C-alpha cells in the first residue's frame, strides 16, 4: 500500500465527490514521479472509502479512472492518477466551441467505460457528467464509484436500504419508487449525463425540486432536446428514458448505437 512520505499534495482543493475532496498531489514512484488526484476523507466513512477503492481495484479498463492505491496517514486518502482537464460539464461549459462530434466521440467513450461495468456486474449510482474526467480533450474516464455496489451472481440490481440523499434528478423511477439500482438504471444517468454534455454542462431540470421531476417523469414528460444537439443523439437520450426499465436498452445496446453513430459522421 501507499506511502504519505512519497506524496506530496498541494492544498488547493480540485472538487468534492460522494465521501471526500479531492486535492491534486504528486507521488514518486521508483524513478519518476505521477501527478495524481487524491481524495481525502472529511465513524463509518473510512469504511466507504475503503469499499471505493475496493470497487475501483477491480477495474481495468481504459474509460475508467485507474487508482494508484490507498494511503493511511494524517487522513485516509485514495491515491487516483490525474486527469488534467477536469469534469466533462466544467469543461464544456468553459469550452463552448467544442464540436458536437466531439462531445460524440467523449460520451462514446463513456459508454464503452459503462458497458465494461456493465459487464463485469457493477452499478454506478452516480453517473453525472460531473464524474466524467477528461485526461484529454478526446479523452475521456468515468470516476467516483463512492455509491457504486458490486451485483450478487444471482441478481441484476441491488436494493438499497434506505434513500440516504441522492442525486435524484440522475435517478430512473424505479430507483426513487423502489431504491432497485441496477445497469439499466445507470443507462437512465447516461442519457441525463448526455442530455448534459450536449447542452454543455447546463444543469438538467433546472430550478425543479427532486419531487418536481418525479412528477415531472410519471407523466411521460422528459427534458427538451439541446441546441444544436444532433437528431439521433437525443433519440438515444429519449430511449435511455424508458420508463419501464425491461424495455429500457442495456449498455451494449447503448454502446451499439453511439458507436454506428460515431462511425457514421465522418
Ligand atoms: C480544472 N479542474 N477542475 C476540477 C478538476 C479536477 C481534476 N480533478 C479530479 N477531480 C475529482 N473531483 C473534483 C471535481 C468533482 O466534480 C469530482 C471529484 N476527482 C478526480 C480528479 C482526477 O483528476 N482524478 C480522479 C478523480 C482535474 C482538473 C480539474
Not at 428514458?241 to 436498452?249: F, I
Request: include cysteine; aromatic fraction near 12%; charged fraction near 25%.
Amino acid at each position: 500500500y501507499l506511502d504519505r512520505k512519497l506524496l506530496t499534495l498541494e492544498d488547493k482543493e480540485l472538487g468534492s465527490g460522494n465521501f471526500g475532496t479531492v486535492k491534486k498531489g504528486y507521488y514518486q514512484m521508483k524513478k519518476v514521479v505521477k501527478t495524481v488526484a487524491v481524495k481525502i476523507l472529511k465513524p463509518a466513512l473510512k469504511d466507504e472509502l475503503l469499499a471505493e477503492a475496493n470497487v475501483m481495484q477491480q477495474l481495468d479498463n481504459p474509460y475508467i479512472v485507474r487508482m494508484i492505491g490507498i494511503c493511511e496517514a494524517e487522513s485516509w486518502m485514495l491515491v487516483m492518477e490525474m486527469a488534467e482537464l477536469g469534469p466533462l460539464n466544467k469543461y464544456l461549459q468553459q469550452n463552448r466551441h467544442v464540436k458536437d462530434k466531439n462531445i460524440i466521440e467523449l460520451v462514446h467513450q463513456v459508454s464503452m467505460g459503462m458497458k465494461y461495468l456493465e459487464e463485469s456486474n457493477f452499478v454506478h449510482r452516480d453517473l453525472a457528467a460531473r464524474n466524467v474526467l477528461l485526461v484529454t480533450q478526446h479523452y475521456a474516464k468515468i470516476s467516483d464509484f463512492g455509491l457504486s455496489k458490486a451485483l450478487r451472481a444471482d441478481e441484476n440490481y441491488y436494493k438499497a436500504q434506505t434513500h440516504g440523499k441522492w442525486p435524484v434528478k440522475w435517478y430512473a423511477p424505479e430507483c426513487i419508487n423502489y431504491y432497485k439500482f441496477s445497469s439499466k438504471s445507470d443507462v437512465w444517468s447516461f442519457g441525463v449525463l448526455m442530455w448534459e454534455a450536449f447542452s454543455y454542462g447546463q444543469k438538467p431540470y433546472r430550478g425543479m425540486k427532486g419531487s418536481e421531476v418525479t412528477a415531472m417523469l410519471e407523466k411521460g414528460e422528459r427534458m427538451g432536446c439541446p441546441a444544436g444537439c444532433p437528431r439521433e443523439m437525443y433519440d438515444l437520450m429519449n430511449l435511455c428514458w424508458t420508463y419501464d426499465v425491461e424495455n429500457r436498452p442495456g449498455f451494449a445496446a447503448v454502446e451499439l448505437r453511439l458507436r454506428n453513430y460515431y462511425y457514421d459522421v465522418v
